[PDB]
Amino acid sequence: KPINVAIFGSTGSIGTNALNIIRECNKIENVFNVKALYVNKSVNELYEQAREFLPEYLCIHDKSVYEELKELVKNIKDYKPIILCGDEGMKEICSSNSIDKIVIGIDSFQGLYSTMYAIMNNKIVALANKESIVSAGFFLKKLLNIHKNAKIIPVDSEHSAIFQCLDNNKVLKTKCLQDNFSKINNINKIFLCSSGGPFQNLTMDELKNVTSENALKKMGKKITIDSATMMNKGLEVIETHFLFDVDYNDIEVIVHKECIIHSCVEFIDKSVISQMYYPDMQIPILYSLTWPDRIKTNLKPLDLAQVSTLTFHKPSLEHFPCIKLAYQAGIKGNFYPTVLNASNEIANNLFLNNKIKYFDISSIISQVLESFNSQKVSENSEDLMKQILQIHSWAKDKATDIYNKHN
Amino acid sequence: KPINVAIFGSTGSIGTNALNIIRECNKIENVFNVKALYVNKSVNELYEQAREFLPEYLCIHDKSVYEELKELVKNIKDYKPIILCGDEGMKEICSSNSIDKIVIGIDSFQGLYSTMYAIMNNKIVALANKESIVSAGFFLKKLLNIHKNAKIIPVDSEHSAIFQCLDNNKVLKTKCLQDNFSKINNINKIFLCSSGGPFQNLTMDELKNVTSENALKKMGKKITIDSATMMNKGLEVIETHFLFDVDYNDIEVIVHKECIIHSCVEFIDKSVISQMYYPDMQIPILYSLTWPDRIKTNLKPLDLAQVSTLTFHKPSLEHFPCIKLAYQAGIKGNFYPTVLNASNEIANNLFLNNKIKYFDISSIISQVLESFNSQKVSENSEDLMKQILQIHSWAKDKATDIYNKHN
């Protein structure tokens, strides 16, 4: 029972965490075969990985460094990998019969495209990219209803925590992103845990003047800023709603600054189940690849006595207005989540580059949401994807226009 | 469609909690049918229950209140119960084709007899009585191996918590008290949570002086004293071992004074899952009857932000020597757990009645354990049962002898 896995975005944070936990687990017993790796342009990192894992497939997106990889790879003896390029490369990896599971560690809005081909090929897709679920949830749901054997397994830490709390005899009667997922699993309510980010004790007057420096002073810049505004958590609320079909009024954000309890599920009997560990991405990634089983790791065991104290408080929506906007957009439904995500892409980047202030982020997003009008949701998958792209591009331009008008 | 249930010990704390959650679940649909109620001698309280629930069977252990019962039940119109007595009645109830699940809320070693008969009739046994598991664990395992369709479902709060944390997809491939349970469920280690009892923060000098009045001043007296000495947790360690096939070195007692996290399971990947709620017996009791499903309750939702802080520490074995005794007795195996439980029954009662001091409890138990000589374990059921009873009585008399010698 070898687990055959492809890694998409294998030089990124997700991709490399995945290779690390695979490496360590394989030292205990040989359970994983890394069949394919795919990166943007990091051709020197890719070579190093390839030497180690000897995957059947390699792929780089950027055509420009295609030949240079072929060069690099000659050195490796014993080894005749299939070396591919761009979207046809990804498409060929997703169609191979020797690949069971695909880790999607490609960032931003980009990664949706590989997700789609993975589903079309009825794979198990370990999806870390929350923005794809928030922007294109409707399209994913439609795709997953066509391709009955395809499944998304969540890797975002809180969503993995929720999923780990479930009974798999009930999970296997449904799958993530299905209507009625929460009803089948007897889910009542979610506690979506947050770190709270750096700005959790600041007053309004202090927040008025915080800068991106304050936010960044250990993750990518975009998610770090989102953690600071708590728009990360707002996006995660929508992610929860789509993944697990939990109503917005049944998702509660709670600030847990110790980051040991990763999230909790309240069932209809009011029993609550939670997943706990040190702050970590190895277990979420591993779980996505072993589900519905678990395997041995040599990770450090949680020492609860040493951790000693766990704390929980409600976030202030006045201080973190991005959370409110995320609920508002989610409850409105339609393509409002697409608009939220896109406008936040812009506002985040503006704040990062010192072009706007903290409360301008939510102000711009709010104004874009107000200017959107709900659209007839295409019944046809292809039209639906085009609608999402159009609306995403519209909302980005609109956020930019609001910035330029005031500025 | 309805689940047909018997309640043994219906007038006690477990029994009345069971009837309360049943009452609420049956408001609109007929979810449960209460087929039988059994008590020792509380014939007035039993009458009151019979009037409300109209069970097919009533049973009193104490035959000296039979006539009183028959007289009370006359006052209920159109109600023709089968009114039984003692062991014979218990055995007839267990034999009825019309009963699916039996809640055992009878206290002390005496709970074993009804548990045994329920198993022998291939029933689902919602077992709250821990003393039966501690005293007769190896015997129940044997019985469960013979009676293939019988199941013990744990009701003790922490063990219910553990059971809930497990994946039912794996649980359904085994059953409690079965060899290999922990392997099939990928269990690594158990965090067994405790309230710590009223004496948790006392110094050694203060602890020397404690009295039963201090421990009592809200549950039955025996278990309240065991909570104060932490012999309750020691018993629960042995209960964990047997129910879940977890090695003693992989059970860690943790004092959680807020009593929200009810216990935790660490799986082989080092992910930890926990169950949490307000301190409660309705969820454990209901879950035992609905497993592997859950049903809606109107219990107050956990308000984690209001609870605000959860703490964890290791208990001092110098202060709570009963814990250490239980681990020693459990690791030694054979009939040492039987001896532990029986000597504790006496030592607890002496303390309750102001005849001995706190440290004399552990002293008596230790001396009885040291005094016991290991016996070859009978290979047949009936002989093993007789052996257990013999050793139980022996250990009680020895505890009493030790007490009498030193005063």
Ligand SMILES: NC(=O)C1=CN([C@@H]2O[C@H](COP(=O)(O)OP(=O)(O)OC[C@H]3O[C@@H](n4cnc5c(N)ncnc54)[C@H](OP(=O)(O)O)[C@@H]3O)[C@@H](O)[C@H]2O)C=CC1
């Ligand atoms: N890791 C974490 O802790 C968390 C991650 N996430 C989610 O994870 C997602 C992935 O981000 P993360 O891994 O953290 O970030 P990174 O920026 O580190 O990941 C980028 C990776 O994707 C590759 N890539 C980018 N574009 C392409 C393309 N067109 N074709 C092929 N490969 C491409 C990059 O290749 P190259 O090296 O060549 O640039 C690199 O391997 C995000 O959407 C985020 O929401 C969510 C919560 C926390």
Ligand SMILES: NC(=O)C1=CN([C@@H]2O[C@H](COP(=O)(O)OP(=O)(O)OC[C@H]3O[C@@H](n4cnc5c(N)ncnc54)[C@H](OP(=O)(O)O)[C@@H]3O)[C@@H](O)[C@H]2O)C=CC1
């Ligand atoms: N209380 C709790 O929340 C918890 C309890 N438990 C376990 O559950 C068990 C019961 O505890 P609890 O309910 O507090 O105990 P109680 O003292 O409250 O109740 C005991 C019950 O058993 C009945 N009974 C006693 N002897 C017999 C007999 N020979 N035949 C039939 N019925 C009998 C009593 O009848 P009568 O009224 O006639 O005396 C009463 O109904 C114990 O083993 C305890 O460890 C474990 C964890 C939690």
Ligand SMILES: COc1ccc(CCCN(O)C(=O)CC[C@@H](c2ccccc2)P(=O)(O)O)cc1
């Ligand atoms: C050393 O760097 C690492 C930090 C963290 C992690 C785990 C990934 C957490 N994750 O799912 C996120 O979505 C990131 C933002 C959230 C978070 C959660 C937990 C801890 C910190 C931040 P927030 O609640 O929105 O603030 C891994 C490595």
Ligand SMILES: COc1ccc(CCCN(O)C(=O)CC[C@@H](c2ccccc2)P(=O)(O)O)cc1
């Ligand atoms: C109103 O009705 C109710 C009755 C009962 C309970 C909870 C039963 C908990 N239980 O399983 C026991 O074994 C009791 C003793 C232990 C405990 C645990 C949690 C809280 C207090 C004490 P300890 O850790 O040994 O001290 C809750 C409510």
Ligand SMILES: [Ca+2]
């Ligand atoms: Ca009488």
Ligand SMILES: [Ca+2]
């Ligand atoms: Ca479970």
Ligand SMILES: [Ca+2]
């Ligand atoms: Ca072990």
Ligand SMILES: [Mn+2]
């Ligand atoms: Mn997250």
Ligand SMILES: [Mn+2]
């Ligand atoms: Mn208990």
